[PDB]
Design a protein around this motif. Structure first.
Motif, PDB file in Angstrom:
ATOM      1  N   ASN A  24      37.959  41.914  38.880  1.00 28.24           N
ATOM      2  CA  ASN A  24      38.963  41.552  39.638  1.00 28.24           C
ATOM      3  C   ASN A  24      40.084  41.244  39.052  1.00 28.24           C
ATOM      4  O   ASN A  24      40.437  40.140  38.873  1.00 28.24           O
ATOM      5  CB  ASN A  24      38.492  40.300  40.607  1.00 28.24           C
ATOM      6  N   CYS A  69      49.292  42.034  43.740  1.00 30.11           N
ATOM      7  CA  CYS A  69      48.283  42.837  44.535  1.00 30.11           C
ATOM      8  C   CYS A  69      46.805  42.841  43.405  1.00 30.11           C
ATOM      9  O   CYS A  69      47.218  43.509  42.543  1.00 30.11           O
ATOM     10  CB  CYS A  69      48.831  44.152  44.587  1.00 30.11           C
ATOM     11  N   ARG A 103      43.032  43.784  42.885  1.00 30.94           N
ATOM     12  CA  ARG A 103      41.843  44.489  43.369  1.00 30.94           C
ATOM     13  C   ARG A 103      40.913  44.409  42.636  1.00 30.94           C
ATOM     14  O   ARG A 103      40.888  44.109  41.465  1.00 30.94           O
ATOM     15  CB  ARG A 103      42.692  46.118  43.646  1.00 30.94           C
ATOM     16  N   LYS A 104      39.675  44.610  42.850  1.00 37.44           N
ATOM     17  CA  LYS A 104      38.462  45.046  42.161  1.00 37.44           C
ATOM     18  C   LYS A 104      38.496  46.242  41.611  1.00 37.44           C
ATOM     19  O   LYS A 104      38.494  47.446  42.037  1.00 37.44           O
ATOM     20  CB  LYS A 104      37.190  45.103  43.113  1.00 37.44           C
ATOM     21  N   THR A 105      38.418  46.275  40.328  1.00 37.35           N
ATOM     22  CA  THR A 105      38.893  47.465  39.217  1.00 37.35           C
ATOM     23  C   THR A 105      37.642  47.675  38.620  1.00 37.35           C
ATOM     24  O   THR A 105      36.941  46.703  37.930  1.00 37.35           O
ATOM     25  CB  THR A 105      39.935  47.324  38.705  1.00 37.35           C
ATOM     26  N   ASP A 147      41.107  50.761  35.537  1.00 35.87           N
ATOM     27  CA  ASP A 147      41.393  51.861  36.509  1.00 35.87           C
ATOM     28  C   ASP A 147      42.744  51.429  37.283  1.00 35.87           C
ATOM     29  O   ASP A 147      43.003  50.261  37.396  1.00 35.87           O
ATOM     30  CB  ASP A 147      40.523  52.199  37.436  1.00 35.87           C
ATOM     31  N   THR A 204      43.385  53.327  40.002  1.00 37.36           N
ATOM     32  CA  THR A 204      43.331  53.726  41.508  1.00 37.36           C
ATOM     33  C   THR A 204      43.734  52.801  42.523  1.00 37.36           C
ATOM     34  O   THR A 204      44.371  53.224  43.449  1.00 37.36           O
ATOM     35  CB  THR A 204      42.027  54.320  41.577  1.00 37.36           C
ATOM     36  N   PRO A 205      43.230  51.707  42.534  1.00 37.40           N
ATOM     37  CA  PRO A 205      43.430  50.796  43.419  1.00 37.40           C
ATOM     38  C   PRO A 205      44.642  50.180  43.775  1.00 37.40           C
ATOM     39  O   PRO A 205      45.398  50.177  44.827  1.00 37.40           O
ATOM     40  CB  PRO A 205      42.388  49.500  43.429  1.00 37.40           C
ATOM     41  N   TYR A 206      45.299  49.961  42.615  1.00 38.84           N
ATOM     42  CA  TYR A 206      46.750  49.475  42.802  1.00 38.84           C
ATOM     43  C   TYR A 206      47.533  50.789  43.126  1.00 38.84           C
ATOM     44  O   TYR A 206      48.616  50.599  43.876  1.00 38.84           O
ATOM     45  CB  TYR A 206      47.193  49.065  41.224  1.00 38.84           C
ATOM     46  N   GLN A 251      46.835  53.192  45.012  1.00 37.93           N
ATOM     47  CA  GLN A 251      46.595  53.194  46.565  1.00 37.93           C
ATOM     48  C   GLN A 251      47.269  52.324  47.290  1.00 37.93           C
ATOM     49  O   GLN A 251      47.888  52.773  48.072  1.00 37.93           O
ATOM     50  CB  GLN A 251      45.073  53.442  46.759  1.00 37.93           C
ATOM     51  N   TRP A 252      47.270  51.116  46.874  1.00 41.97           N
ATOM     52  CA  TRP A 252      48.185  50.169  47.493  1.00 41.97           C
ATOM     53  C   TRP A 252      49.743  50.400  47.536  1.00 41.97           C
ATOM     54  O   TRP A 252      50.399  50.117  48.327  1.00 41.97           O
ATOM     55  CB  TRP A 252      47.924  48.813  46.876  1.00 41.97           C
TER      56      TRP A 252
END
Lengths: 151, 262, 205
Positions: C63, C71, C73-75, C104, C106-108, C110-111
RNA sequence: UACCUGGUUGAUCCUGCCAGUAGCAUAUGCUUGUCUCAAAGAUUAAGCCAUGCAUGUCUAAGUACGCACGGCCGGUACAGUGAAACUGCGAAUGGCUCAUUAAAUCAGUUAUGGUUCCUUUGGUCGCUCGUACUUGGAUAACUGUGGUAAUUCUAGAGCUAAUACAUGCCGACGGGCGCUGACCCCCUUCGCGGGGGGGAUGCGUGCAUUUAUCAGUGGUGACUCUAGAUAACCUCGGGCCGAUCGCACGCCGGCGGCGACGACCCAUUCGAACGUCUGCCCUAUCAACUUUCGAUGGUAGUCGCCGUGCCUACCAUGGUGACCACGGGUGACGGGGAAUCAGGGUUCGAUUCCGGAGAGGGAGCCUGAGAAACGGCUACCACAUCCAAGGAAGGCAGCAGGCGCGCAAAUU
RNA sequence: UAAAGUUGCUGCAGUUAAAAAGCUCGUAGUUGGAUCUCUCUCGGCCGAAGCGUUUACUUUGAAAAAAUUAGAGUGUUCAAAGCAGGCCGCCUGGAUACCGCAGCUAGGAAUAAUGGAAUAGGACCGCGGUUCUAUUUUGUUG
RNA sequence: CGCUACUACCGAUUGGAUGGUUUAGUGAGGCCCUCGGAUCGGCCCCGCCGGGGUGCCCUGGCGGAGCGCUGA
């Protein structure tokens, strides 16, 4: 005057230095917020601590240490260690049989923060008790008094 | 070594229990409770050594297991239960109530109180803290946590709580001119008016107290327990009113009492 | 076993120390949790007072936090690239505190797309993936686009952050102790910290 | 009671010791009629141990189909006493001894704002927004078949319970709060105009767990304290929000009063642990010591309950000494304290209180809140018991008792 | 242990009885001459606030286990002890002192000490000249 | 200086006695094997009729195996 002289990044853990800025409102390094506290018992924070840039996690003013317990004093005798100095505490011990005293001393390895610059051998330093900072160090320099025989 | 001890040698017991050395090897090791080991009074000592209602610890056990003893309004069957300063002991079968108040010689006196005064007690607050969604809390010398205290109640003040409901009824601020009691040290048991407090940051504060007859003494702040507003007490004081007599006047009073009464 | 006592140590003067007791239980030490990268395997160890420590042995998910944008995220943890204590903790790829890791983006990212209202950035090669351009273009009312524009007014990402986002990996620092809590959490490196650690990795390589 | 006396010479003054003298402590000799109190295998051997005992425990309230006894109807699940056994708790206290141990232990002082804490006492305990009228593998006791020369060894088979353990959301079920936004209306105007509230498929909602602003609720001398807010996470070895008992007979398919036992978490109740501010015997025929092996400090980590070279990596050469470091010795556990009173001191303190250490010597562990526990376990070393020779079982520096050692110390 | 003023700090001795180094420098140690008598807030004697140059003293005041010791009381039949004991249900006690040194607190300043102005690099005054402004305003916030 | 009342040092001695004091190797161990897993376990593809929200199919005793799925 680089601060990052170690393998890891040096920064105060409390201060966040990645806040978003404004392009049209920024020209040059604006400011880096400084974390400092006032320790108790009437000790004033030195100027070089408030407006300095050094990173010292053992500094009583800009570090994580809390001063609690004995407030002692001594004279600086050696300054050959990184952020640590050796002070000597002289006292007279009473021998009851002879009704007289003898000179004795103990050396204490105390932590000296970079807020105290140009401290010289022979100066009187006021130290405060803190948690064990190393194998032998348990006191932090709180105030440096210049010796009477100084410039 | 290796975990807590469960015994108390009779000679290592607190000296204010007035235990004698030839009775046994052991003293009743007070159980854990709202009061410290060295400044409490085990229920067996009160029931046997002071009130003489029982001759042995077995008889104290019988009395306690008959659910006759109430401390602070609650039935206590533990014979080594630590009862301490301002604790109310009510024995309904014999219809008497006691309040544990230090006598002027630093010992818990057998101080009988009326049943109206047995419905409340004074508690010095030890800390005030805020927790669990901004709910103020209050910790007393009695280890009682009272939620939602008055915002004017700060540390070293003493509150008055009703025993039945366990809620704060009134409080006295810690200030000069207020009556106080000393709960520890050389001046333990003395009652007087607070005259001056010296603050020593990083160390213990010193409070200076003056008696009714003008005797002035001092003790650490932790040993001060304010009794009432001004010079009047909110609780009933023992036979001595907190005045410590010098040994000369003690001897003079004893001799006069011996002379007058035959 | 492993002891953490100080009475086996030479005195400050350098004199030898003679023990007055044998090793106590409360002075014990335990083997290190060389938390490698792999499918999550966490062992529980009972400690003093009956409490529990989480001795993580393998972790691939953490996390992490993007501090400037707030921001977190779980990464997924991809690699370790710098250790300020020992080089062998990078060669053997162990997760310890204050170690620099690749995570990664990808979550950041995407946010940030859910934040996206910025002008033309890096959209040359395109993606041509349907049902993804909804989060960038969409159909929206006037005041919603006004709010998105006022958000774009204060959008500013560092060039190093962009260069990392292109590669799909981000530089982060482990701010937790996986061998003690079982979690490899932290924050994405930004600013002078990111520059300093980039210089460290470059000089090492 | 601030005390002296005999002895060097043919005789005299003096240095000076020897001897006398009184107490105290251990041994011993002789003697011994009452009565009260009372030390007692410390000194040598922390040498070795036959045997017996020294730690067990049930309430109304965890589990009773053992006729083992027992009742008032043997067609009303459990009437009661209840051995066994499962479960819980204790066994980490106490008692013994003084071997080790010389800033070590310990004493006074102070700190934990650098930690953990069974139990007690207050005791957050409908604060979670989509089969609950009670869920499930089991297993002991008991019944039967056994193996072994042997142990508080246990196997196979047949039954049967729970307070080892809940993976429910019928209940606050309309929620409230903060959001990737299909509809809505306004202020001098039919030209993109700056600003306001409801609304759903679609997201989330607690201080013990780590990476975050302005108030910085309430505190401290001082917090990177407490409280609050947003973004998220939440462990094969999961995580707290209750799947149970108590004799009276009472209320407008339902509610109710006292308890018992559990359980996160907060409160230093009992503590423990870690910090060395000061103080410890003799010795220089011990003057320099420490730094492949952490020696002193710094940085980052590991580990730990936590602070810390505690450990690892890198970096800097530091750190301690004639104000006795370091080394050696101690017939050294430390202290409270004990043996004369001139005043001052000199010796002693194994010994009932406090602290520490150890359980033949080392070492390593399980359980547990708490042990590096030994009337716990696992090895090796030294002794040592039974054996059918395959194996099995040991730890009196506990109380008594033996042997040994001794000048030296009690009743199985 | 006292006697042993034969270990001498009090308090020994060193010409000839045992004894001053052959002599002189010398660092540590020990000792060291006179001299100094709108600073501060509610009501025209009060808490706060003290760098008086830190101290050493001296005298207080807290905190320093109990037992032992000293010591108060109390006819154990006296005493060693113990913490207890009468009156045709009531009275009491179960004190106090000392607890070295080192830490904490508080007058006056005798007396080892420490001497704040000497290339003046020494209070108090008018200038705020880019700055933080009772955590910038003081009719409906500019 | 041809007598005895008179242990130790030196012993052209290394003849002996509770004698662990550190190198260098080997080596005990809570098996913290991520190479290990015949056994033990409510659906997993059935035997078949325990019986239903339909003596008519979301079923209450796995007889019974297959390194296929999962569990200490």
């Amino acid at each position: 005057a680089d601060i990052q002289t170690e393998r890891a990044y040096q920064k105060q853990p409390t201060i966040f230095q990645n806040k978003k800025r404004v392009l049209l409102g920024e020209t040059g390094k604006e400011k880096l917020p400084r974390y400092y506290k006032n320790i108790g018992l009437g000790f004033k924070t030195p100027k070089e601590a408030i407006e300095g840039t050094y990173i010292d996690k053992k500094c009583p003013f800009t570090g994580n240490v809390s001063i609690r317990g004995r407030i002692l004093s001594g004279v600086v005798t050696k300054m050959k260690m990184q952020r640590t100095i050796v002070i000597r505490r002289d006292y007279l011990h009473y021998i009851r049989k002879y009704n007289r005293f003898e000179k004795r001393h103990k050396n204490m390895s105390v932590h000296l923060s970079p807020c105290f610059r140009d401290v010289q051998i022979g100066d009187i330093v006021t130290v405060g008790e803190c948690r064990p900072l190393s194998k032998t160090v348990r006191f932090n320099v709180l105030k440096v008094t210049k010796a009477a025989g100084t410039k | 070594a290796r975990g807590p001890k469960k015994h108390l040698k009779r000679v290592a017991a607190p000296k204010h229990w007035m235990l004698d050395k030839l009775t046994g090897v052991f003293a009743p090791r007070p159980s854990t409770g709202p009061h410290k080991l060295r400044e409490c009074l085990p229920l067996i000592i009160f029931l046997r050594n002071r009130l003489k209602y029982a001759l042995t610890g077995d008889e104290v056990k019988k009395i306690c297991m008959q659910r006759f003893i109430k401390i602070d309004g609650k039935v206590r069957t533990d014979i080594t239960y630590p009862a301490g300063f301002m604790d109310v002991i009510s024995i309904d079968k014999t219809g008497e109530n006691f309040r544990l108040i230090y006598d002027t010689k630093g010992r818990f006196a057998v101080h009988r109180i009326t049943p109206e005064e047995a419905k409340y007690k004074l508690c010095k607050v030890r800390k005030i803290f805020v927790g669990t969604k901004g709910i103020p809390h209050l910790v007393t010398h009695d280890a009682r946590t009272i939620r939602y205290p008055d915002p004017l109640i700060k540390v070293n003040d003493t509150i008055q709580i009703d025993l039945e409901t366990g809620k704060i009824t009134d409080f006295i601020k810690f200030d000069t001119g207020n009556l106080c009691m000393v709960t520890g040290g050389a001046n333990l048991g003395r009652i007087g008016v607070i005259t001056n407090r010296e603050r020593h940051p990083g160390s213990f504060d010193v409070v200076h107290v003056k008696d009714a007859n003008g005797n002035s003494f001092a003790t650490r702040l932790s040993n001060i327990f304010v009794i009432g507003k001004g010079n009047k007490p909110w609780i009933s004081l023992p036979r001595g009113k907190g005045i410590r007599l010098t040994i000369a006047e003690e001897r003079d009073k004893r001799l006069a009492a011996k002379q007058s009464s035959g | 076993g492993i002891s953490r006592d100080n009475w086996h140590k030479r005195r400050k003067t350098g004199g030898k120390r003679k023990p007055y007791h044998k090793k106590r239980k409360y002075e014990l030490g335990r083997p290190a949790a060389n938390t490698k990268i792999g499918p999550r395997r966490i062992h529980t160890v009972r400690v003093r007072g009956g409490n529990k420590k989480y001795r993580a042995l393998r972790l691939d998910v953490g996390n992490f936090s993007w501090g400037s944008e707030c921001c977190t995220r779980k990464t997924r943890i991809i690699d370790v690239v710098y250790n300020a204590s020992n080089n062998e903790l990078v060669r053997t790829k162990t997760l310890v505190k204050n170690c620099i890791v690749l995570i990664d983006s990808t979550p950041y990212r995407q946010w940030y797309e859910s934040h996206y209202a910025l002008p033309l950035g890096r959209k040359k090669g395109a993606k041509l993936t349907p049902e993804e351009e909804e989060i960038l273009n969409k159909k929206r009312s006037k005041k919603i686009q006004k709010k998105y524009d006022e958000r774009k007014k204060n959008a500013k990402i560092s060039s190093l952050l962009e260069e990392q986002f292109q590669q799909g990996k981000l530089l982060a620092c482990i701010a937790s102790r996986p061998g003690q809590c079982g979690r490899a959490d932290g924050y994405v490196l930004e600013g002078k910290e990111l520059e300093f650690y980039l210089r460290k990795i470059k000089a090492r390589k």
